[PDB]
């Protein structure tokens, strides 16, 4: 499974109706995927690990993108995940600040790849929820929990280093 920016889907599925149980139960997952094809694939993966159910003897009765409920309010997100290193597998709890749930999960994927060299096929996201400010554990979010927060932008590195490529004056980094 590759990436991009992720979307959250809810995928609801069931086993196929045999003439023993004419109404098999429905199951629902929240799945963070680049698109709905990857969403259905990851659904069948997870539900096959959990229940004895395969894509052949089953169906997707619904696969639909969950939109962000409040995409203009900055939320804290707690991610409960498991992954596996080159050695055995580990449980983990991360915290992020974002506007969207899928944005925070994408942030978690790039962060796990950065800090633990973990690939997306190694990561399994098992819980994601919206944390308030007073329930957070990580200092990288609790330092932004301040109502009168204030900081400068100290060392502004020039970015247009090629427009111009040859100038006569050296750039300034204080602004």
């Amino acid at each position: 499974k590759a990436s991009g920016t992720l979307r959250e889907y809810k995928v609801v599925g069931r086993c196929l109706p045999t003439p023993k149980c004419h109404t098999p139960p429905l199951y629902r997952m929240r799945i963070f995927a680049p698109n709905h094809v990857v969403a259905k694939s990851r659904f069948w993966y997870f539900v096959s690990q959990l229940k004895k159910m395969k894509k052949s003897s089953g169906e997707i009765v619904y696969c639909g993108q969950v939109f962000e409920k409040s995409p203009l309010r900055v939320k804290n997100f707690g991610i409960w995940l498991r992954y596996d290193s080159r050695s055995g597998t580990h449980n983990m709890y991360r915290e992020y600040r974002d506007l969207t749930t899928a944005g925070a999960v994408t942030q978690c994927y790039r962060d796990m790849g950065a800090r633990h060299r973990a690939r997306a096929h190694s990561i399994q996201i098992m819980k994601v929820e919206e944390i308030a400010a007073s329930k957070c554990r990580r200092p990288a979010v609790k330092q932004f929990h301040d109502s009168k927060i204030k900081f400068p932008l100290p060392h502004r590195v020039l970015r247009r280093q090629h427009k111009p490529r040859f100038t006569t004056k050296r750039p300034n980094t204080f602004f």
Partner: protein
């Protein structure tokens, strides 16, 4: 040192991006690289914006963080920024830059003639000024 700070109510100038050349109020801060951002009187709806894309001005509005658009809009209007800016000389510097970009060919000819005559007059006055300032014969 550090006269401008990223804070709630700070007005920044979006320099590149889809909202380039715009004015923006900082509503909240999202984690060290982005800010929740809303320009209601400069026609920029609320979104996340990179500090790499914004440049801080000297104007600070007054509202609590994560307030609504009507509150940031009336805080913009009471001591409106569209008249403080534009009669700041950053803004008219930008304005001169864009009209110099829009300057046509006949306009370029007239600018050449006017600038040529103006430089002639200034140069002759400079020559007179230094030839008068050389009148020094004191022990």
């Amino acid at each position: 040192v550090f006269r401008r700070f990223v804070e709630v109510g700070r007005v920044a100038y979006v320099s590149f991006g889809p909202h380039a050349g715009k004015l923006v109020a900082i509503v909240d801060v999202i984690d060290q690289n982005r800010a929740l951002v809303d320009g209601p009187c400069t026609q920029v709806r609320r979104q996340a914006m990179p500090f790499k894309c914004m440049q801080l001005t000297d104007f600070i509005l007054k509202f609590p963080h994560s307030a609504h658009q009507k509150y940031v809009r009336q805080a913009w209007q009471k001591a409106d920024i569209n008249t403080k800016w534009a009669a700041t000389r950053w803004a008219k510097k930008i304005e001169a830059r864009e009209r110099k970009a829009k300057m046509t060919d006949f306009d370029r000819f007239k600018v050449m003639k006017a600038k040529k005559m103006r430089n002639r007059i200034i140069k002759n006055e400079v020559k007179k000024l230094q030839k008068a300032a050389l009148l020094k014969a004191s022990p």
